[PDB]
Amino acid sequence: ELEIEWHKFETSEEIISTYLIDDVLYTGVNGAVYTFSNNELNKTGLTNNNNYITTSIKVEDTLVCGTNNGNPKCWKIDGSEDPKYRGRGYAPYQNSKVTIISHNECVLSDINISKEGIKRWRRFDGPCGYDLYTADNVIPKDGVRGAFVDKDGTYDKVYILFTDTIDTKRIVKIPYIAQMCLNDEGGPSSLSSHRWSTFLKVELECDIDGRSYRQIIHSKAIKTDNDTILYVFFDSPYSKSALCTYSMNAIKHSFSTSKLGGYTKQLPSPAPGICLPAGKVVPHTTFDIIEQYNELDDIIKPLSQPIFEGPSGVKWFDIKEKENEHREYRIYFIKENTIYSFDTKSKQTRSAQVDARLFSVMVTSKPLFIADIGIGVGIP
Amino acid sequence: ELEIEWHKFETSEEIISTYLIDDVLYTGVNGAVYTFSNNELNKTGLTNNNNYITTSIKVEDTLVCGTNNGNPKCWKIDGSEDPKYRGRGYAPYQNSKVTIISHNECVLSDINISKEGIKRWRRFDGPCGYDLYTADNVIPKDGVRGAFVDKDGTYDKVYILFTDTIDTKRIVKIPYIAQMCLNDEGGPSSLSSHRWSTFLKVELECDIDGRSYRQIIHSKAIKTDNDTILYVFFDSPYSKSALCTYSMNAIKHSFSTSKLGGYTKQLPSPAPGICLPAGKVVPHTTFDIIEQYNELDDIIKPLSQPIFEGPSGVKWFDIKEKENEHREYRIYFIKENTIYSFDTKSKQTRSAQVDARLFSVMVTSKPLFIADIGIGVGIP
Ligand SMILES: *[C@@H]1O[C@H](CO)[C@@H](O)[C@H](O)[C@H]1NC(C)=O
Ligand SMILES: *[C@@H]1O[C@H](CO)[C@@H](O)[C@H](O)[C@H]1NC(C)=O
């Protein structure tokens, strides 16, 4: 059961992105950007030629970047101009799905940097160092589906989830998680000087009854006491989708200990995925290995629960820990027209119909649902 | 729509096998064997300790073999004793699904030959030659799902469809078709003297919308003018099944021309899968290759139509060409409780409910459905 109150726009404005910046909702739409907070929907127009606003990251001010008519360009929050004139790798050249995260002041994104569009995963210039980019064909043309930053004890690391499409005898999709060192310095050489030197990846695995799911929809890493737990949502070309959970501690341990797939010899002293003390640069042997064989000979198996299967075609999902109990969540996952909630404790799924073209669910303290009608806020 | 008239037994007798011998239905049940012809249901008791009758092949007389209490033993049709005392590889040691075909006088079967039960595909002693068996781990523990004999222009060849379960990093099922020379003489050596020397296999492929099906249920090869067409029915751990069709001419061409997967060098003069003139024996080099790399570097892609998708859990399927048109069939596929027909021309699927625990559909001139209640015969 769910009662949602609707703060709608004046018109049905095609949603293009939704972000949470310090419990303030930033809904990038065509034309303006909407700002939800305290049930207050402040719309701010920027331009309207094409200008699909897609990015609303926060570095120092929450700058907001869009694509004004095939030219990507940023702004300050209130339509003002960006001092640093950011905007190349911050917004796509055309309306697309993006993945752009911002740590302290360090923007990482998969957004296309040029017009042609070779897919790469980049960290842009800032406190971490100069720009970086993954070698080609590493990131699939579909893009990076999830990205989040997590401590590795002492060094920040960036994790990204994507779905590769291998094609040898038949096309097989494979879900991957990939780790990189947030403060990587680049490779050793001059050509490989702006390339990640700590990029590694493992296959995930979400099997239930011999049906293995392989297409990532969306991810979210909740931070708990002993470690953080990663919730992935897989879709399938069949009529099903499946939420799995993985223990980031198990993943980190696997990254640090497992062996590189296809590489049989002894791994060098600064082990490939390992972060390095500030200013250090990966040697050449380690880098040659880490670029040739960048996949561990392993497979991350999910936690025991909650694995569950919902409909096919879910688009978003967000978690909200129940205030009464603890480590028991309500996972609100959203389809084009129908809300669904799932309680990790009772393992029952509730549903609800809503006559709108939903786009996302965000959760700050109460699930707010971003649909083309406008925003809604939910109370059961 | 379908009206079926029911010739039922006196009791609900657990069906264990059904065969068509010259348009006579032979229904092996627990205890007796039933014989349907001209709407006449002649039951013939043989023994009743355990005696799950499973085989009703025809060599010279249609002998019928069962498993009398963990001892496999054959009989003549009318309960009489077998002169040659056949019965080892003709009936399983316990109730199981079997695959046993009979060409002219040459019984081929995957039935377990001993108590332990290593799965192999065997040709038994008779006009073709002495017994033969496939090397171990070639046939999956699930068994061989379909088998039929087809000319290769001049030499008879045996084709078998099974589903391998490869397990390297995750478990993947792979459907395979495999060809052997019916009059193979065995390998060259003394150890490999009763092993097939002409065994090869390719992957099939039944993909529809990026969903690839890999679990074979049942096969049937219809013989047409220019060639024969192979109808395979795949199941999936998801909620779907798919019928595909393959052109045996394409398969034969692929077997004769394609290259052995993993073998990069030049194939020897008596090409591996190639039948040999009577009395000839495969050389040693050809045999070493054919045993090491017995899979072609290829994949058989289905015909254009009819590919279709029906429910998950279908158990049988049989074809009946429409009397009016030609090359247009009615495919009756049967589920545990529900009949389904599918017309290749109209591409519409009809269904029908029947309150019985169906076991199979046979088609002689009118589809007769073998359920535990008894036999039924259908007219639309
Ligand atoms: C929304 O706009 C009104 C209009 O001035 C302003 O008073 C209010 O502070 C704004 N709130 C936010 C969260 O921007
Ligand atoms: C069925 O049994 C009857 C009983 O004698 C016999 O006359 C008839 O020929 C049998 N038919 C077949 C097909 O066995």
- Token pair 């019985």 is found at B356
**A238 contacts on B by Cβ (under 8 Å):** 211, 236, 238-240
| Span between the terminal Cα atoms of chain B, in Å | 6
Tally the domains of chain B: 1
Q: How many helices (H) and strands (E) does chain B have?
A: 2, 30
Residues 6+ apart with CB under 8 A from B50: B30, B67, B68, B69, B70
Reduce the DSSP state of residue A4 to 3 states and report it: strand
What the block records as the tokens of B380 is 């639309």
Q: Are A354 and A339 a contacting pair, CB within 8 Å? A: yes
Experimental method: cryo-EM
Q: Is B42 in the pocket of ligand 2 (CB under 6 A)?
A: yes
* Closest residue by Cα to residue A63 from A37, A40, A84: A84
Q: Is A312 exposed, middle or buried (0-12, 13-18, 19+ CB in 10 A)?
A: middle
What the block records as the tokens of A166 is 């291998």
Of B212, B238, B299, nearest to A211 by CB-CB distance is: B238
Give the span between the Cα atoms of B175 and B213, in whole angstroms.
Answer: 8
Per-residue burial over B11-44, b if 16 or more Cβ lie within 10 Å, else e, is: eebebbbbbebeebbbbbbebbbbbbeeeebeee
Beta-sheet pairing, A329-334 with B52-55: unpaired
Q: Are B203 and B300 a contacting pair, CB within 8 Å? A: yes
Q: Is B213 exposed, middle or buried (0-12, 13-18, 19+ CB in 10 A)?
A: buried
- Token pair 């039948």 is found at B275
Give the span between the Cα atoms of B250 and B257, in whole angstroms.
Answer: 10
DSSP state of A195: B
Give the span between the Cα atoms of A235 and A125, in whole angstroms.
Answer: 34
Q: Which atom of ligand 1 is nearest to the CA of A42?
A: 1
Query: B212 to chain A, minimum CA–CA distance in Å?
Result: 9
Mutate to test the interface with A, among B168, B214, B238 (most CBs of A within 10 A): B238
Angle subtended at Cα B169 by Cα B167 and Cα B171, rounded to the nearest 5 degrees: 40
Q: Using CA atoms of A350, A353, A359, A363 in order, give the dihedral in degrees to the nearest 10.
A: -40
Amino acid occupying residue A262: G
CB neighbourhood size of A364 (10 A) = 16
Query: Under an 8 A CB cutoff, do B169 and A203 touch?
Result: yes
Residues 6+ apart with CB under 8 A from A326: none
Of B171, B209, B299, nearest to A170 by CB-CB distance is: B299
Angle subtended at Cα B269 by Cα B264 and Cα B272, rounded to the nearest 5 degrees: 65
Q: Is A22 in the pocket of ligand 1 (CB under 6 A)?
A: no
Reduce the DSSP state of residue B192 to 3 states and report it: helix
CB neighbourhood size of A327 (10 A) = 12
For residue B250, the domain's CATH number is 2.130.10.10
What the block records as the tokens of A92 is 């796509």
- Token pair 């994104």 is found at A109
Mutate to test the interface with B, among A165, A169, A171, A258 (most CBs of B within 10 A): A169
DSSP state of B268: P
What the block records as the tokens of A111 is 């957004």
* Closest residue by Cα to residue A140 from A215, A75, A190: A215
**A236 contacts on B by Cβ (under 8 Å):** 211, 238
CB neighbourhood size of A67 (10 A) = 25
If phi over 0 gives left and psi between -120 and 50 gives alpha, with beta otherwise, what is residue A274?
beta
Cα–Cα separations (whole angstroms), residue B13 to A209, A225, B24, B77, B167: 32, 61, 19, 19, 39
Cα–Cα separations (whole angstroms), residue B318 to B27, B109, B354: 16, 21, 17
Give residue B263's domain range: 1-380
- Token pair 């054959």 is found at B74
Residue A181's DSSP bridge partners are A157
Angle subtended at Cα B290 by Cα B289 and Cα B293, rounded to the nearest 5 degrees: 75
DSSP state of B324: S
CB neighbourhood size of A110 (10 A) = 25
Q: Residue A289: phi, psi to the nearest 5?
A: -65, -50
Beta-sheet pairing, B308-310 with B241-247: antiparallel
* Closest residue by Cα to residue A215 from A246, A182, A244, A249: A244
Query: Under an 8 A CB cutoff, do A170 and B207 touch?
Result: yes
Residues 6+ apart with CB under 8 A from B356: B337, B371, B372, B373
Q: Which atom of ligand 1 is nearest to the CA of A37?
A: 13
Minimum-distance ligand to the CA of A35? 1
* Closest residue by Cα to residue A333 from A319, A321, A354: A319
Q: Which helix (H) or strand (E) holds A287?
A: helix A284-292
What the block records as the tokens of A272 is 């490939």
CA closest to A296 among chain B residues: B169
The sheet with strand A3-8 has its strands ordered as A3-8, A374-379, A367-371, A358-363
Query: B360 to chain A, minimum CA–CA distance in Å?
Result: 26
- Contacts for B82-89: CB closer than 8 Å, 24+ residues apart: B86/B124, B88/B113, B89/B113, B89/B122, B89/B124
| Span between the terminal Cα atoms of chain A, in Å | 6
Resolution (angstroms) stands at: 3.1
Q: Give the HSE-up count for residue B130: Cα atoms under 13 Å, Cβ half-sphere.
A: 8
3-class SS string, A227-263? CEEEEEEEECCCCCEEEEEEEHHHHHHHHHHCCECCC
Q: Is A379 exposed, middle or buried (0-12, 13-18, 19+ CB in 10 A)?
A: exposed
Q: Using CA atoms of A171, A172, A176, A180 in order, give the dihedral in degrees to the nearest 10.
A: -30
If phi over 0 gives left and psi between -120 and 50 gives alpha, with beta otherwise, what is residue A79?
left
In B207-366, where does DSSP find H-type helix? 248-257, 284-292
